[PDB]
């Protein structure tokens, strides 16, 4: 698990995959902007994704990507993860407060992780 | 246009986004790894990318946020895309011989962009 929370705190750019009724959406942020709470919560700012909060309305289900060359991993150099959650938009309490340093923040998307698989 | 050429000369993680009837599929590959030819085409290197070809067997439409923090885009600092496509996978032509460097490649994964988006 340690080697999920070094890849937090290095460059890095974050995927995030949503369900429409139109196929799936993808957006993106930065390793180091999000962040984890209790009940494998991982809080991430929300400034646009107005089109990812549309689906997630319709649909919870979310996958995220997220790794780092510097963290070494399976085979050696590098880790990358696969994330599969449902999402949800709070507007309030602990997890957007996670969030609030970020004044451009609108809300927070809150991902609790069902699996983390190593995919590099 | 030549900001998206800068970017694939860059350090980054390319995510690639398909659909299944499971919901959405996600997977990566590096900014430097991508091979763009004409025709809109842009071809990655298939290791493994197993999920990812039965989705594409069945829907070929894909989507891919790639991007370079030291690419300077519409509000100054940085710049990522969201790309639009269509996906095929190929095991002979001009677009194998592309990624063919990287011996471990079992096929190519060719994209046709139809639309591409500064989203940074
Ligand atoms: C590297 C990168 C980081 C980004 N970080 C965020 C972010 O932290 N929060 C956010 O709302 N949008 C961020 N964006 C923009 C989103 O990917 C997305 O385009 C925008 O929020 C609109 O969302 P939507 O397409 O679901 O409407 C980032 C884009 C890039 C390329
Ligand atoms: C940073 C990073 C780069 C990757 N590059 C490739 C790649 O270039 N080609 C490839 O087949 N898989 C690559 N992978 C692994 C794929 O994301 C994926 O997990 C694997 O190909 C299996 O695909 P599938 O889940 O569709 O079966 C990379 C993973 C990471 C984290």
Redesign the pocket.
Known sequence: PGTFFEVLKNEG?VAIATQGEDGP?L????NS?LKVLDGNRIV??????????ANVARDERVLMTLGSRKVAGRNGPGTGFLIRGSAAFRTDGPEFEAIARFKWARAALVITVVSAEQTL
Do not use: A, F, L, Q
């Open positions: 750019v959406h957006v993106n942020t930065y902007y991430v700012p929300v400034g646009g994704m107005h089109k990812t909060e």
